[PDB]
Every structure is written in C-alpha cells, then in structure tokens.
Amino acid sequence: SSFFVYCKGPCHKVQPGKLRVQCGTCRQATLTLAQGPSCWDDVLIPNRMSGECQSPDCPGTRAEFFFKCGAHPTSDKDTSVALNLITNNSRSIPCIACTDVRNPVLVFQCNHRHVICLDCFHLYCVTRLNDRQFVHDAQLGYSLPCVAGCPNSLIKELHHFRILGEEQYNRYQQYGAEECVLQMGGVLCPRPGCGAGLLPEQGQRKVTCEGGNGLGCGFVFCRDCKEAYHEGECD
C-alpha cells in the first residue's frame, strides 16, 4: 500500500513509509509471516498476527510491526511513527476546509469520514492549541475531534500532532500534561515560574509545592483561591 509516517529525522515532515516486521521475542527480522496484514489493527495492536522466526534457536511466533521513513535509506532501528489517519486521496475528495483536492489527506474517524489536507490540518491544530481548545480524555490523551464538529472523532494516535512542528508539538505535550494533572484532580502551582504539577490529597486545602531541589518551589497555597494559604475564606 501507501503508508505515511512522521520522519522527525532528516525529512522533518510527513513522508511515505515502509512497513517492516521483526520477531516479537528475538527482536530480529527473521520472522516469516503467514499472511499479509489486511487492516490497521493487524499492525497496530500487538500479537495480532503470528509467524515463524527463522532464527535457529528462537521459537518466536508474534509479529511486531514497525515503520520507517521511505524517502531515504534508514538504519533498521531508526523508526518513524505511522500516521494511520493519513492516506492517499484515491477517490480525489476535496478538502472540507480549503475545498482544494490535494494529496495526501487526513481522514477523520467520524461517521462521515471527513477529509482535510495537511496544510489545513496544520492550521486547525495550531489555532486550536493557541486557543487552548484541545480536548483531554482520560483514556485517550490530549487530542482534537474532526474539525467539522463531529462526535466520537477524537484522534487516537496522538503522534498525528507532530504536524504542529517541533516547537508547537512540545507546547502541545506540555499543555496536555497540564490538563492531565488537572483531570487527575491535581492543581498547578500558581507561583509564576514554578508551574509544578501537584497531586495533593483530596481534602487537603493546604498544598505545598515541595518535591525537592529543582522539583518544587516551596510555595504553600490554597487550592480554592490559589493564594498563599490563609486560614479564613477566599474574599
């Protein structure tokens, strides 16, 4: 087929990819596959497929798949993440945003399977991230739904957000860790410059940002009002 991966190495962009397989036990490329994979789950979920490792004293049976960038030679362990939502525009569907017919495209897992070109998908993610309009799901992570507002369309493989570029991608990881602790029931240290993620006990109103040296800033504050701990109420 035609796979797509994010090559953080030389290309620093989305590129067509190679599908490769190693033995699940000896982590070597000697496993013969019984039949080719026929769907994404075959290569994404582990031990979805079985084969025979040809290493003399290895009984490996489990297929472990991985992808490489296809745009240049790669060393066999310089992997890239498959962006499984990205595909060639075989049916030539216009972008739901710029209405231009382009290739390749990202196809959301919403019921309509809406299509967006990578440039527009880039603009979607950046503005939604500046606005702090990414969505956190406790099972899935910090993600985004189909741009058209469809339900149950949260992108599952979060490496799609590599399209943000390196700086925006790192900010995305940070915001998402911030929203994670908050979802965990924690609080963000209000001391400007510290910003630790704190996990105080539930009842505790007196939170102390003290993980140690370089870990916490020492501040003691009030969950409800976010000032240094007072014993009265938040005016």
Binding site: L140, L158, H159, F161, C180
Partner: protein
C-alpha cells in the same frame, strides 16, 4: 535509545531505554538517578497517564521524545 523525562517545572532527566522497556522499568531508571520512589511517580505522554504494566512501544514513544513526570505526595 535515549528519552527525556521532563517535569512541568522544567527539570530534565535523560535516560537510556529500549522500546520494549516497560513504564515500570522507566520509573525504576528514574529513581536510580533521582531518589524518587517509583510509587510517587506519575508519567504522562501527550496528556495520557502511562500505565505501569505497558511498554514504551505501547505508546509509540520515539527516540528522544519526552515524557512528563508529576509527583504524588
């Protein structure tokens, strides 16, 4: 391969790992460098908590990608 564990405060740790390493191994590797009991460690990647039993490859963590660390009491 190398990976980084970052706190939200900015402290950066650098670890040698294999993609098959489980999150529990990672947390041990952290306590070797920092003295933080693994029990107190919460690891986040792309806003998802990492489960102690699953592997770095389970989350498709790439070489030189960054995990976030948060501490529990």
């Amino acid at each position: 391969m190398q990976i980084f564990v970052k706190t939200l405060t900015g402290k950066t740790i650098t670890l040698e790992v294999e993609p098959s390493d489980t999150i529990e191994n990672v947390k041990a590797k952290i306590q070797d460098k920092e003295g933080i009991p693994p029990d107190q460690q919460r690891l986040i990647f792309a806003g998802k908590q990492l489960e102690d039993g699953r592997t770095l490859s389970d989350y498709n963590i790439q070489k030189e990608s960054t995990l976030h660390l948060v501490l529990r009491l």
